[PDB]
Design an enzyme around this catalytic site. Structure first.
Site, PDB file in Angstrom:
ATOM      1  N   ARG D  48       0.863  -1.222   0.000  1.00 32.58           N
ATOM      2  CA  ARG D  48       0.000   0.000   0.000  1.00 32.58           C
ATOM      3  C   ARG D  48       0.886   1.254   0.000  1.00 32.58           C
ATOM      4  O   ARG D  48       0.627   2.195  -0.739  1.00 32.58           O
ATOM      5  CB  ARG D  48      -0.939  -0.036   1.193  1.00 32.58           C
ATOM      6  N   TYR D 101     -16.893  15.394 -16.687  1.00 36.66           N
ATOM      7  CA  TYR D 101     -17.285  13.990 -16.467  1.00 36.66           C
ATOM      8  C   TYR D 101     -18.342  13.938 -15.331  1.00 36.66           C
ATOM      9  O   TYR D 101     -18.138  14.512 -14.251  1.00 36.66           O
ATOM     10  CB  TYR D 101     -16.072  13.083 -16.127  1.00 36.66           C
ATOM     11  N   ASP D 173      -7.486  18.054 -15.189  1.00 37.61           N
ATOM     12  CA  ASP D 173      -7.820  16.680 -15.581  1.00 37.61           C
ATOM     13  C   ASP D 173      -7.465  16.562 -17.058  1.00 37.61           C
ATOM     14  O   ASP D 173      -8.169  17.146 -17.913  1.00 37.61           O
ATOM     15  CB  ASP D 173      -9.273  16.362 -15.259  1.00 37.61           C
ATOM     16  N   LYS D 198      -8.336   5.432 -19.581  1.00 36.84           N
ATOM     17  CA  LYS D 198      -8.652   5.927 -20.945  1.00 36.84           C
ATOM     18  C   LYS D 198      -7.397   5.789 -21.819  1.00 36.84           C
ATOM     19  O   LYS D 198      -6.943   4.648 -22.020  1.00 36.84           O
ATOM     20  CB  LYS D 198      -9.268   7.334 -20.847  1.00 36.84           C
TER      21      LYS D 198
HETATM   22  C1  LIG Z   1       0.917  -3.566   7.321  1.00 35.74           C
HETATM   23  C2  LIG Z   1      -0.478  -3.851   7.580  1.00 35.74           C
HETATM   24  C3  LIG Z   1      -0.951  -4.557   8.808  1.00 35.74           C
HETATM   25  N1  LIG Z   1      -2.288  -4.432   9.100  1.00 35.74           N
HETATM   26  C4  LIG Z   1      -3.265  -3.941   8.360  1.00 35.74           C
HETATM   27  C5  LIG Z   1      -4.657  -3.871   8.838  1.00 35.74           C
HETATM   28  C6  LIG Z   1      -5.633  -3.153   8.124  1.00 35.74           C
HETATM   29  C7  LIG Z   1      -5.310  -2.382   6.869  1.00 35.74           C
HETATM   30  O1  LIG Z   1      -5.384  -3.267   5.735  1.00 35.74           O
HETATM   31  P1  LIG Z   1      -4.494  -2.945   4.391  1.00 35.74           P
HETATM   32  O2  LIG Z   1      -3.008  -3.001   4.799  1.00 35.74           O
HETATM   33  O3  LIG Z   1      -4.896  -1.571   3.922  1.00 35.74           O
HETATM   34  O4  LIG Z   1      -4.935  -4.056   3.424  1.00 35.74           O
HETATM   35  C8  LIG Z   1      -6.919  -3.083   8.637  1.00 35.74           C
HETATM   36  N2  LIG Z   1      -7.250  -3.715   9.784  1.00 35.74           N
HETATM   37  C9  LIG Z   1      -6.351  -4.446  10.515  1.00 35.74           C
HETATM   38  C10 LIG Z   1      -6.817  -5.119  11.781  1.00 35.74           C
HETATM   39  C11 LIG Z   1      -5.032  -4.509  10.078  1.00 35.74           C
HETATM   40  O5  LIG Z   1      -4.153  -5.117  10.768  1.00 35.74           O
HETATM   41  C12 LIG Z   1      -0.173  -5.189   9.808  1.00 35.74           C
HETATM   42  O6  LIG Z   1      -0.587  -5.079  10.989  1.00 35.74           O
HETATM   43  O7  LIG Z   1       0.839  -5.750   9.603  1.00 35.74           O
HETATM   44  C1  LIG Z   2     -17.219   5.741 -17.570  1.00 34.48           C
HETATM   45  C2  LIG Z   2     -16.123   6.665 -17.372  1.00 34.48           C
HETATM   46  C3  LIG Z   2     -15.863   7.825 -18.275  1.00 34.48           C
HETATM   47  N1  LIG Z   2     -15.046   8.810 -17.774  1.00 34.48           N
HETATM   48  C4  LIG Z   2     -14.295   8.803 -16.687  1.00 34.48           C
HETATM   49  C5  LIG Z   2     -13.479   9.963 -16.287  1.00 34.48           C
HETATM   50  C6  LIG Z   2     -12.862  10.012 -15.023  1.00 34.48           C
HETATM   51  C7  LIG Z   2     -13.035   8.921 -13.998  1.00 34.48           C
HETATM   52  O1  LIG Z   2     -12.062   7.886 -14.237  1.00 34.48           O
HETATM   53  P1  LIG Z   2     -12.381   6.344 -13.765  1.00 34.48           P
HETATM   54  O2  LIG Z   2     -13.619   5.868 -14.553  1.00 34.48           O
HETATM   55  O3  LIG Z   2     -12.643   6.387 -12.282  1.00 34.48           O
HETATM   56  O4  LIG Z   2     -11.077   5.610 -14.116  1.00 34.48           O
HETATM   57  C8  LIG Z   2     -12.138  11.143 -14.678  1.00 34.48           C
HETATM   58  N2  LIG Z   2     -11.993  12.171 -15.542  1.00 34.48           N
HETATM   59  C9  LIG Z   2     -12.552  12.175 -16.793  1.00 34.48           C
HETATM   60  C10 LIG Z   2     -12.329  13.368 -17.687  1.00 34.48           C
HETATM   61  C11 LIG Z   2     -13.333  11.091 -17.176  1.00 34.48           C
HETATM   62  O5  LIG Z   2     -13.927  11.090 -18.301  1.00 34.48           O
HETATM   63  C12 LIG Z   2     -16.489   8.132 -19.507  1.00 34.48           C
HETATM   64  O6  LIG Z   2     -16.696   9.349 -19.739  1.00 34.48           O
HETATM   65  O7  LIG Z   2     -16.862   7.327 -20.278  1.00 34.48           O
END
Ligand SMILES: C/C=C(/N=C/c1c(COP(=O)(O)O)cnc(C)c1O)C(=O)O
Ligand SMILES: C/C=C(/N=C/c1c(COP(=O)(O)O)cnc(C)c1O)C(=O)O
Ligand SMILES: C/C=C(/N=C/c1c(COP(=O)(O)O)cnc(C)c1O)C(=O)O
Ligand SMILES: C/C=C(/N=C/c1c(COP(=O)(O)O)cnc(C)c1O)C(=O)O
Ligand SMILES: [Mg+2]
Ligand SMILES: [Mg+2]
Ligand SMILES: [Mg+2]
Ligand SMILES: [Mg+2]
Ligand SMILES: [Mg+2]
Ligand SMILES: [Mg+2]
Ligand SMILES: [Mg+2]
Ligand SMILES: [Mg+2]
Ligand SMILES: [Mg+2]
Ligand SMILES: [Mg+2]
Ligand SMILES: [Mg+2]
Ligand SMILES: [Mg+2]
Lengths: 379, 379, 379, 379
Positions: D48, D101, D173, D198
């Site tokens: 992450r 958008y 954007d 895109k």
């Molecule tokens: C480096 C990460 C560890 N933990 C993470 C964690 C997360 C956060 O989940 P993401 O890491 O965002 O998938 C949420 N909830 C609990 C009880 C957790 O332990 C770790 O402790 O070693």
């Molecule tokens: C269905 C999506 C279209 N567009 C998206 C879009 C996004 C948002 O990006 P994610 O879709 O979250 O990757 C951000 N910024 C601009 C100028 C965009 O057109 C579409 O128009 O067809």
């Protein structure tokens, strides 16, 4: 003296040197920069020749079978093909089992025979038949144990001595048992073959094969054919196979326990004529299985009293067991070998009985599997 | 009458029926549920036999070459091996080029010869030599054009007539040109071979091969060997190859334009003895290339005045061209065939000159590529 | 009444309709063809909104927790962020644990406080402290049990009644226990949070998060934020998480058995001051753990007699346990929370003791894990 | 002074140190082994926080936009959300475009307004309207150019001066133009936003977002939110986005040439009331587009004489253009913004005309695209 489960997670799989990444990267690359001509970095030059993700899988498999060299291929059948292209030539002879995966039979009889390799199918459970089947041209004895799909048993150590006395190689297709249950190299096999598609990958989501050998020179001859014929496992498939291998022990433990429960449900069921499982004391070769297998596997076959008609009905009626080819997945599978995996053996010495059903008992909650079979068996 | 770029994006690649997904899913599966025994869904049963992602790639390649059937393999070399196992047997003879990928030479001379296939290497640019090399046992003429690495040219239509008069197949390895520049089936080839690792995948990130045929029966014989020997492209590799194919036209356009500029820089450079490019009017076979190729490709070879020593120095000195095996990637590659891809031809009729450097001119900004070569060439 | 292991393999994962593929395809697609404007196929329109591979993971997680709706996110932290953005606004108050993942603390104190959300950290093992911490503005009680890293226990059913009496939601971060050991919705939780990075994916190879809810309307409010804020799990990561879930039962069984053995080795070791494990009868909250957990988990924490200096030495000295952040993988991990995962809690009510070591006991052969700890502990 | 196409292939993408792998590995890992507590290898600790494949994509994007720092996210919308959570708080004000958008509108009006951020939609083509819309609370001006879907043009350099005079940030954007056509940081933008879904990914097969900044401190504040909120691009999606970026130049060249041809077919077609394309000399803002864009893009919008009824009929009738949300793929897409991407703007200042059709002109053979539109337009 690291244990099997430790090796399955760690062998070939040291953390990345540069980044510490705990899991082997997916080297989705064809080629590798050299530092001057022939200045290889880490020994890599071209992915067909060697790929670091595939090397990790190859080293892990070598550790689990206790061999010197592993080689990963595009499928089980491609491992078989590379093996046979390496060790045979026109004029040679092969002994194969009288019950074996239909693709093995098909490759030997429909491809290698045309390319000048003679063969005979022998009852490998009968060492006398094996010893008398040796010809001066015999280069290898090809063993499955347990066999696909009858689960017949061959004494690896005994057949190794027969092969070696004839200056032949012993090849053991260890697909059904896996390295967790059976280690053919430790009993004198020269080559272990796997379809990694089955228990090693474990999740019915990656077709692959492998070879593991005891002898480094045979390993180099095979590797020359891996490179030259190019039937390699790609890095992402190798990576998923290696991920699957990490849970082989815990999966197989549960496959064996669930299969033992399923066998109890099948034995004495009034619609079932015969149950084939190496753990049954009256199964042919039970005592050999006890001495060479840690446990008796996830595969169970059985014959319906009502013939082909009854077997086809059971196959269609399961709701948890999925009707499909393949085996060794976490999900339970059912099939009719005569019309599915072994249609290719119809009319041969390897023809399977038309009343037979093959189960790959998965790791689902056992009562759900038993209840599913019991409703499917009800006429 | 859809155009090439349209087919590359759409052929085999209708939106998913159930979900409308515009891109072919990655069917990372070994097996397929059947509706009763033999009740296949959509014709699928087991991924080695056929996989829907691999079918999409196979159908797309068939459309681009104008063939009836495509087949995808684990590497270029595995496509070659499956082809030769299918069409040859002990006692047969092959004509191969006198300049060809070293792996092709290695597979024929070091594997198929041991398996009883005789061969001769011929100058395919000389149709008389090809016609007189035919033997009563000749099953195929194996053509590369342009050749790897000299970029010699063979008249496909002419050699097709010679092959067919002898009841032999014409095989064209169309790896260097790609289907965008050259369509051998349209000139009477029976089989097209590709390393999809090169221009088709296009990004030096997936090893793969393909066969495309004109004749549906030969396609079924090859497919039997694809299934039986199992040297298949896995679904994720097939998927990346298919993704690469979508930009083949725009990539190749830029490879050809950048290569023409690089050739201008090399011609008359005082350290360069000779430049090999099919677009040069004095290149041997230029007029044949004009009639059978849309454009002359991204590959450029050249010979250094200062011999092997000078060639090895150039190879080590580039900072944008990467010193590595392989070709057809977006990134520029440089190598010394004599010590790298064609070390396997040393001592044979296919030995490459030790003063030769091979370029795969990529799609980087052309001035950066020209400037990189000019600094590397400076003694 | 299908069992947990059956659901983990089958829920959301019917074989593909068109092809029968037994494993959910990887829908590596951004968009979906519509049959006329608004004519959705299978309800799909754009992958951020919904993707068929992500739907399979979401439906499986809902089945395993017994909820109506699952939602998959780019990480555990992104699941937390989407949850809190949905259920809170400026002026609201949160009760959080006095021992919790440092990232949870960091998101609440360093991001949501700046955005106008007040908070208090409470001993959730003390229901009186929880009841008196309720404010008129309190929207949710955020529970970890067991806590990261002390493994303190909170009575979910008791805290659900306190939350509901205040018209607040009970959120349970069920990451450490997993749905195999603990089912918070069944005890009155409103929301379950997971880092799927940990036991659900199971292989230290995919960062991801999930939410599961009991109430379909809250599920739709969360889904609006999943779509609008877009912190989605991508399809390949979702696919690997789902693959991992298939072996959760067999993995967790072995994690629990290996952890019990490791606890036996640590208890009474002369260098170890204290062992924290919910299965120890004298562990605070042991009786609550017995009533709400099937087993006591793979996590073990302990405090060194020789202080921070001794803890850092143990962390560096293990050869099988890998020194790294994260937990819940097949491979054993060790860390120092004070300087690693919980450096973000230094100076707060959630500061961890500097003499503490946290273990994620993996599924390696137990003697290898015990022997590795014993050599690392030796001064 | 490396050129754009060179950077797209090489920036962030040096060959692997250990193996020479020419393509960045897929680091499908959650965590990283440390050499003693805090002994990071190569600066990595947890995916992450940072992942080497994601770093490569982030460094490449920074190079292409000329920024100091790139950050990759789970979607375009997640990049927007992390940006706004970082730079805004309750009480702040945002200026957004009056054509944008629909998801951007939805995130600002339906999520950030509830969280205390005020907003106004302004005609960004009118610098006077932008200057008078500034409030003492204004933290940022959010610019799309060209706008989605009308393709209106905003003078980036002019609006940068207005933003900076007010101590506000200019956010652009740059999704529609891509870094190949337009470089907002070079004209004084503080932040560039992309949906990498895109043109950057380019193949309608990976949802993702990115931020690029000029100022290293703002980059660190954003990175804190990337880590803390966790809405990261996973490594395989990042890898595919990076693969797509390698062909951006050659793809965009062909998108622009095909779009110019499509505009010629639409202009004066008797069923077409109006064609919107920045390259048309009478398009509002044409002269600004000429000074800030290399070329005018692949997007084309047009209004049907026969109203909503006629627009919906065209959308349903194309056989090569696929009716679907999204844009910037190699494959041509068509949609009706009023009922599809911009249903979320109905009833607002950003409502789109019901007679409008939006095209994403792909890289298919141009005659096939023109012929497809001409048959779809025929009443
Ligand atoms: C480096 C990460 C560890 N933990 C993470 C964690 C997360 C956060 O989940 P993401 O890491 O965002 O998938 C949420 N909830 C609990 C009880 C957790 O332990 C770790 O402790 O070693
Ligand atoms: C269905 C999506 C279209 N567009 C998206 C879009 C996004 C948002 O990006 P994610 O879709 O979250 O990757 C951000 N910024 C601009 C100028 C965009 O057109 C579409 O128009 O067809
Ligand atoms: C459909 C396939 C089944 N078997 C395959 C198999 C292979 C061949 O392995 P690939 O399928 O090429 O990975 C090799 N060796 C053994 C003992 C096998 O059972 C099946 O029986 O259900
Ligand atoms: C290292 C490989 C190079 N060539 C390969 C190649 C293959 C064999 O294709 P796989 O490598 O098996 O995909 C087949 N046919 C031709 C004309 C080839 O050049 C190379 O030259 O640099
Ligand atoms: Mg390594
Ligand atoms: Mg290493
Ligand atoms: Mg018969
Ligand atoms: Mg389809
Ligand atoms: Mg279809
Ligand atoms: Mg010599
Ligand atoms: Mg489905
Ligand atoms: Mg379905
Ligand atoms: Mg302090
Ligand atoms: Mg690197
Ligand atoms: Mg590097
Ligand atoms: Mg209205």
């Amino acid at each position: 003296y690291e244990g099997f489960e430790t090796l399955a997670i760690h062998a070939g799989q040291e953390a990345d040197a540069e980044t510490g990444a705990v899991v082997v990267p997916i080297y989705q690359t064809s080629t590798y920069r050299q530092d001057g001509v022939g200045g290889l970095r880490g020994g890599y030059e071209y992915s067909r020749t060697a790929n670091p993700t595939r090397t990790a899988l190859e080293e892990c498999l070598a550790a689990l079978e206790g061999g010197v060299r592993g080689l990963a291929f595009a499928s089980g059948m491609a491992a078989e093909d590379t093996l046979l292209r390496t060790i045979a030539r026109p004029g040679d002879h092969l002994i194969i089992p009288n019950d074996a995966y239909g693709g093995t039979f098909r490759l030997v009889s429909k491809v290698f025979e045309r390319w000048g390799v003679s063969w005979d199918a022998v009852d490998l459970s009968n060492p006398e038949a094996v010893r008398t089947a040796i010809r001066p041209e015999t280069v290898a004895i090809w063993v499955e144990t347990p066999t696909n799909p009858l689960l017949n048993i061959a004494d690896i150590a005994a057949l190794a001595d027969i092969a070696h006395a004839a200056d032949a190689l012993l090849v053991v297709d260890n697909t059904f048992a896996s390295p967790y249950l059976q280690r053919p190299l430790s009993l004198g096999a020269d080559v272990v073959v796997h379809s990694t598609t089955k228990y090693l990958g474990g999740h019915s989501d990656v077709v692959g094969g492998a070879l593991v050998v005891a002898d480094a020179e045979l390993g180099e001859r095979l590797a020359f054919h891996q490179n030259s014929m190019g039937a390699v496992a790609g890095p992402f498939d190798a990576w998923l196979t290696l991920r699957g291998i990490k849970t082989l022990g815990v999966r197989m433990d549960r496959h064996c326990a669930n299969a033992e429960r399923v066998v109890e449900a099948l034995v004495g069921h009034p619609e079932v004529a015969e149950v084939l499982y190496p753990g049954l004391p009256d199964h042919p070769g039970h005592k050999v299985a006890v001495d060479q297998m840690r446990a008796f596997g996830g595969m169970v076959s059985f014959r319906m009293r009502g013939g082909e008609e009854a077997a086809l009905r059971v196959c269609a009626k399961t709701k948890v067991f999925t009707l499909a080819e393949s085996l060794g997945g976490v999900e339970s599978l059912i099939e009719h070998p005569g019309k599915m995996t072994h249609a290719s053996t119809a009319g041969s010495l390897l023809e399977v009985p038309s009343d037979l059903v093959r189960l790959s008992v998965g790791i689902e909650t056992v009562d759900d599997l038993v209840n599913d079979l019991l409703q499917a068996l009800e006429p």
